[PDB]
Enzyme design. Structure first.
Site, PDB file in Angstrom:
ATOM      1  N   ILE A  71      18.866  30.000 -36.325  1.00  0.00           N
ATOM      2  CA  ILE A  71      18.250  30.951 -35.369  1.00  0.00           C
ATOM      3  C   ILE A  71      18.211  32.324 -36.045  1.00  0.00           C
ATOM      4  O   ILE A  71      19.297  32.774 -36.474  1.00  0.00           O
ATOM      5  CB  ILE A  71      19.022  30.970 -34.048  1.00  0.00           C
ATOM      6  CG1 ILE A  71      18.777  29.658 -33.291  1.00  0.00           C
ATOM      7  CG2 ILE A  71      18.578  32.170 -33.204  1.00  0.00           C
ATOM      8  CD1 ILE A  71      19.729  29.441 -32.132  1.00  0.00           C
ATOM      9  N   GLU A 160      22.667  22.702 -33.359  1.00  0.00           N
ATOM     10  CA  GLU A 160      23.724  21.777 -33.797  1.00  0.00           C
ATOM     11  C   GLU A 160      23.464  20.434 -33.151  1.00  0.00           C
ATOM     12  O   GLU A 160      23.715  19.381 -33.784  1.00  0.00           O
ATOM     13  CB  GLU A 160      25.127  22.284 -33.439  1.00  0.00           C
ATOM     14  CG  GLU A 160      25.441  23.555 -34.168  1.00  0.00           C
ATOM     15  CD  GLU A 160      25.813  23.464 -35.627  1.00  0.00           C
ATOM     16  OE1 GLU A 160      25.389  22.513 -36.296  1.00  0.00           O
ATOM     17  OE2 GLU A 160      26.502  24.388 -36.081  1.00  0.00           O
ATOM     18  N   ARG A 163      20.938  18.717 -35.209  1.00  0.00           N
ATOM     19  CA  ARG A 163      21.444  18.211 -36.516  1.00  0.00           C
ATOM     20  C   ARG A 163      22.254  16.941 -36.299  1.00  0.00           C
ATOM     21  O   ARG A 163      22.263  16.104 -37.260  1.00  0.00           O
ATOM     22  CB  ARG A 163      22.320  19.272 -37.187  1.00  0.00           C
ATOM     23  CG  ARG A 163      21.554  20.496 -37.625  1.00  0.00           C
ATOM     24  CD  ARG A 163      22.535  21.583 -38.018  1.00  0.00           C
ATOM     25  NE  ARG A 163      21.864  22.726 -38.553  1.00  0.00           N
ATOM     26  CZ  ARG A 163      22.211  23.957 -38.265  1.00  0.00           C
ATOM     27  NH1 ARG A 163      23.159  24.159 -37.373  1.00  0.00           N
ATOM     28  NH2 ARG A 163      21.602  25.003 -38.761  1.00  0.00           N
TER      29      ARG A 163
END
Ligand SMILES: Nc1ncnc2c1ncn2[C@H]1C[C@H](O)[C@@H](COP(=O)(O)O)O1
Length: 246
Positions: A71, A160, A163
């Site tokens: 970000i 996250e 991912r």
């Protein structure tokens, strides 16, 4: 662009947003069936826009570097906000250029710095969908200390989760009740660059890690990752940071 509406959100709709976010990131190649993010993207195409809406329909637009899911900054009404780092400065040339003013937050976007600015490590900040509602509300109007905590929640619940499938599922468990991240969650966030590196190198080493990675698993227990048949590589990791960007 991708969108997530907290009003009416449930585990299914969060799961669809994280699928949307992963699919907006370009790749030319998969390594062991996991998308390999690009080494580099010139100009404005580097940045994906995520539109997030709190329970009350108020919105921020978040800018995300598509090479590393970092970000960079966000737009609330007429004010853009960027991390105090060179890559966010670069992003502010391409995104949020119809904004009245641009505030440089008084910290970089890395976890160690945000934690100092927030006054709490990630280990002690509750995460979940209500937490993301609170984070969106915090970021609508400048407050740098409040915004550090809010950004730690925003990063974990978007980037996250994109991912790691396990982190996506931990936020789904927290759809209606926030909870400090699990030990496996913080382990995976800390390990993404290392796992990405060892998975690319395992191409050339018969799927064997040249340097084994120490994680925490879903049951709280140490697991040593030595090769690509590990559940973390076959099920969990969803995106690989390119070796060029390590
Ligand atoms: N701004 C921002 N956007 C997206 N992802 C972020 C950001 N800051 C930290 N992180 C994520 C990404 C890193 O791979 C990792 C750092 O974990 P560690 O082991 O603690 O260094 O957590």
């Amino acid at each position: 662009d991708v969108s997530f509406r907290l009003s009416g959100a449930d585990p299914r709709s969060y799961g669809m947003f994280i699928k949307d976010l992963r699919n907006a990131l370009p790749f030319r190649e998969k390594v062991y069936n996991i998308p390999l993010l690009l080494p580099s993207v010139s100009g404005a195409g580097r940045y994906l826009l995520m539109h997030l809406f709190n329970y009350d329909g108020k919105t921020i637009t978040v800018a995300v570097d598509v090479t590393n899911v970092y970000i960079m900054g966000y737009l609330a009404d007429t004010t853009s906000y960027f991390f105090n780092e060179p890559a966010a400065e670069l992003a502010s040339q391409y995104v949020f250029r119809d904004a009245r003013r641009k505030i440089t937050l008084p910290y970089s976007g890395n976890y160690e710095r945000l934690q100092i600015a927030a006054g709490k490590p990630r280990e002690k900040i509750p995460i979940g969908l209500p937490a993301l509602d609170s984070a969106i509300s915090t970021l609508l109007h400048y407050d740098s200390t409040a915004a550090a905590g809010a950004l730690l929640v925003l990063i974990q619940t978007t980037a996250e989760a994109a991912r790691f499938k396990y982190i996506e599922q931990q936020i789904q468990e927290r759809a209606y009740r926030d909870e400090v991240p699990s030990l496996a969650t913080i382990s995976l966030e800390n390990s993404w660059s290392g796992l990405s590196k060892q998975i690319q190198l395992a191409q050339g080493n018969n799927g064997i890690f040249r340097t084994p990675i120490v994680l925490v698993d879903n049951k709280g227990n140490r697991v040593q990752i030595t090769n690509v048949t590990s559940k973390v590589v076959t099920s969990n990791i969803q995106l690989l940071l390119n070796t060029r960007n390590i």
